[PDB]
Amino acid sequence: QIFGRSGSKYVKVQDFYDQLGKYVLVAPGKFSGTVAATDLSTGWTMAWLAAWNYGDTCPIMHHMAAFPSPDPYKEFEFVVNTQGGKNLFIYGVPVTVEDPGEGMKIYRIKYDGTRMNLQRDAAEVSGLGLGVHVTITPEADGYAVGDGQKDICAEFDRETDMVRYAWAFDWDPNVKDLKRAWLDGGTMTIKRLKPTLPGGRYDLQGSKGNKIDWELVPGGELAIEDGKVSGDRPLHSVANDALVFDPRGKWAVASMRLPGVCVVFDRENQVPVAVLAGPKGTPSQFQLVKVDDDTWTVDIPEVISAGHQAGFSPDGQSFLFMNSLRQNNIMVWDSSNHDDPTTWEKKAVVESPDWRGAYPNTFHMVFTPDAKKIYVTMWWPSPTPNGIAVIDAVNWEVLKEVDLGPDMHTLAITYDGKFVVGTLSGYQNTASAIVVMETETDEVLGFLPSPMGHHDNVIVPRTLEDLRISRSTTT
């Protein structure tokens, strides 16, 4: 140890890192314009990258996901997207760039044991730019991006960065009044999106395709209803969030925020197979109707609540969709039947008197490796302290809530199940940190500095199995 003259020992922070293991945390920084990998075994930032260095004129570094690497310390690859345009104006920061870049870039970056290397922009390769959740396929042979301004999600080939398939979603509201457009129901169309360009390419880079000028914020479903969200076709919006993956392969689920549904897709045969109904009180599913070989519809009598967070248990047994704002809860499906998602039926709802209000919103989660516990974020607007709720995933009950500080975002877990590692991001202008909480008795062990506005974080997985509790099955 290190002793004073008094024989009292100094605290070495290295002692704190010793216990965490050999794990590499990565996180983008939103308005900071940077992305950073951290060695949780030493406290060092291993390498960071500033997209402005590459001529990016709106480097709002947004979602990300890391491919497994046998040894992350020697190398790993990862995907990180950006947003642009009026997403720049939506936080508490008096930005002065009135005409910023359009974003929707999808960067491929490789850490090489020393530095980050920006490989290319896959949105340029494919011509498809998408700016919300990034996930890796369970096979680690590609990745997926959702976007809630264009309402397009797509799975991409890891090697080529070419779109394997893309789905576009559209809203036909029963009542063409923004106030009632979702409440009073409507019909959502699912359309196969095909390349319109030479070389198998799309012509949907940057803001091409945008229905609204920014991604809705938490509870922003109120704001688009209230006419506060500008764009060409807000009545047509469904706010696609993510395409998450069944860890057993075959199925991918696209979350649609405004109509409160998730669409299960056959990855191989590239068709939709089921629509899951979010709000408590609705059946397990809504009816999928084929119109033609490229087009399907689903009618929703009414939208009781918006939904947001979506994903699978590591064993593929359960599927989860969070209702948010008008109901705050966790809706749970039995997805044990890997053969037929039309059989998936609701089996539980995690609820709490504490979720009475319009907040908190439960918009990120991570499961323990053994699928018995979930850690779920609790977000509020300033100044309410944000935190984590620990969920019993066997009985479907809230074990515990802890307060942390402002603007809680994502949660990752060391692959041995021992430590949850999360990010708080200051609403882009105030306090921000990495938080560490041990999963045995669920005690917060403290904070590490992180001067970034993280809307995502991952721990680099070693294996296909690690990926089941990484940015692949949940967001």
> Least separation, in Å, of the C-beta of 32 and Cu ion?
12
Among 22, 71, 74, 115, which residue sits at the site for a second copy (rule: CB under 8 A)?
Answer: 115
Among 22, 92, 194, 270, which residue sits at the site for a second copy (rule: CB under 8 A)?
Answer: 92
455 annotated to a ligand binding site: yes
241 annotated to a ligand binding site: yes
Using CB under 8 A as the binding rule, whether residue 395 contacts a second copy is answered as no
Using CB under 8 A as the binding rule, whether residue 337 contacts a second copy is answered as no
User: Which tokens sit at 419?
Assistant: 């430590």
364 annotated to a ligand binding site: yes
Among 315, 351, 438, 465, which residue sits at the site for a second copy (rule: CB under 8 A)?
Answer: 438
- Give dist(CA 203, CA 152) in Å, integer: 13
Q: Which of residues 177 and 370 has its CB atom nearest to a second copy in the complex?
A: 370
- Give dist(CA 168, CA 171) in Å, integer: 11
215 annotated to a ligand binding site: yes
> Least separation, in Å, of the C-beta of 379 and a second copy?
18
Give me the torsion for CA of 174, 177, 179, 180, rounded to 10°.
Answer: -20
> Least separation, in Å, of the C-beta of 425 and a second copy?
10
Q: Which of residues 214 and 355 has its CB atom nearest to a second copy in the complex?
A: 214
354 annotated to a ligand binding site: no
454 annotated to a ligand binding site: no
Q: Which of residues 101 and 127 has its CB atom nearest to Cu ion in the complex?
A: 101
Using CB under 8 A as the binding rule, whether residue 24 contacts a second copy is answered as no
Q: Which of residues 41 and 189 has its CB atom nearest to a second copy in the complex?
A: 41
User: Which tokens sit at 340?
Assistant: 């037929």
Q: Which of residues 132 and 435 has its CB atom nearest to Cu ion in the complex?
A: 132
Using CB under 8 A as the binding rule, whether residue 38 contacts a second copy is answered as yes
Using CB under 8 A as the binding rule, whether residue 301 contacts a second copy is answered as no
Residue 46's DSSP bridge partners are none
The one-letter amino acid code at 139 reads: E
Q: Which of residues 241 and 466 has its CB atom nearest to Cu ion in the complex?
A: 241
Using CB under 8 A as the binding rule, whether residue 32 contacts a second copy is answered as yes
Q: Which of residues 331 and 436 has its CB atom nearest to a second copy in the complex?
A: 436
Please choose which of a second copy, Cu ion, none residue 241 contacts, taking the beta carbon within 5 to 8 angstroms, the exact cut-off set by kind. Answer: Cu ion
63 annotated to a ligand binding site: yes
The answer to whether residues 376 and 330 touch, using CB atoms and an 8 Å cutoff, is: yes
Using CB under 8 A as the binding rule, whether residue 12 contacts a second copy is answered as yes
User: Which tokens sit at 119?
Assistant: 């490989």
User: Which tokens sit at 162?
Assistant: 């070419």
> Least separation, in Å, of the C-beta of 235 and a second copy?
32
How many residues at the interface with a second copy, by CB under 8 A? Answer: 69
Q: Which of residues 59 and 85 has its CB atom nearest to a second copy in the complex?
A: 59
Compute the C-alpha angle 391/393/397, nearest 5°: 50
The answer to whether residues 435 and 93 touch, using CB atoms and an 8 Å cutoff, is: no
The answer to whether residues 228 and 209 touch, using CB atoms and an 8 Å cutoff, is: no
Using CB under 8 A as the binding rule, whether residue 429 contacts a second copy is answered as yes
30 annotated to a ligand binding site: yes
Among 227, 283, 357, 449, which residue sits at the site for a second copy (rule: CB under 8 A)?
Answer: 449
Using CB under 8 A as the binding rule, whether residue 420 contacts a second copy is answered as no
Per residue, what are the HEC states of the chain? CCECCCCCECCCHHHHHHCCCCCEEEEECECCCEEEEEECCCCCEEEEEEHHHHCCCCCEEEEEEECCCCCCCCCEEEEEEEECHHHHHCCCCCCCCCCCCCEEEEEEEEECCCCEEEEEEHHHHHCECCCCCEEECCCCCEEEEEECCCCEEEEEECCCCCEEEEEEEEEEECCCCCCCCCCCCEEEEEEECCCCEHHHECCECCCCCCCCCCCCCCCHHHHHHCCCCCCCCHHHCCCEEEEEECCCCCEEEEEECCCCEEEEEECCCCEEEEEEECCCCCCCEECCEEEECCEEEEEECCCCCEEEEEEECCCCCEEEEEEECCCCEEEEEECCCCCCHHHCEEEEEECCHHHCCCCCECCCEEECCCCCEEEEEEECCCCCCEEEEEEECCCCEEEEEEEEECCEEEEEECCCCCEEEEEEEHHHCCCEEEEEEECCCCEEEEEEECCCCCCCCEECCCCCCHHHHCCCCEC
Q: What is the contact surface with Cu ion in residues (CB under 5 A)?
A: 241, 455
Using CB under 8 A as the binding rule, whether residue 399 contacts a second copy is answered as no
407 annotated to a ligand binding site: yes
User: Could you tell me which stretch among 13-21, 152-160, 174-182, 281-289 binds a second copy (CB under 8 A)?
Assistant: 13-21
Q: Which of residues 5 and 356 has its CB atom nearest to a second copy in the complex?
A: 5
Among 168, 181, 243, 452, which residue sits at the site for a second copy (rule: CB under 8 A)?
Answer: 452
Instruction: Note the residues at the interface with a second copy (CB under 8 A).
Output: 2-6, 9-19, 29, 31-34, 36, 38, 42-50, 52-55, 59, 88, 92-93, 95-98, 114-116, 405, 426, 429-434, 436, 438, 440-441, 443, 445-453
Residue ranges of the annotated binding site are 15, 30, 62-63, 98, 120, 133, 161, 215, 236, 241, 308, 324, 338-339, 364, 407, 409, 455
Residue ranges of the annotated binding site for Cu(2+) are 15, 30, 62-63, 98, 120, 133, 161, 215, 236, 241, 308, 324, 338-339, 364, 407, 409, 455
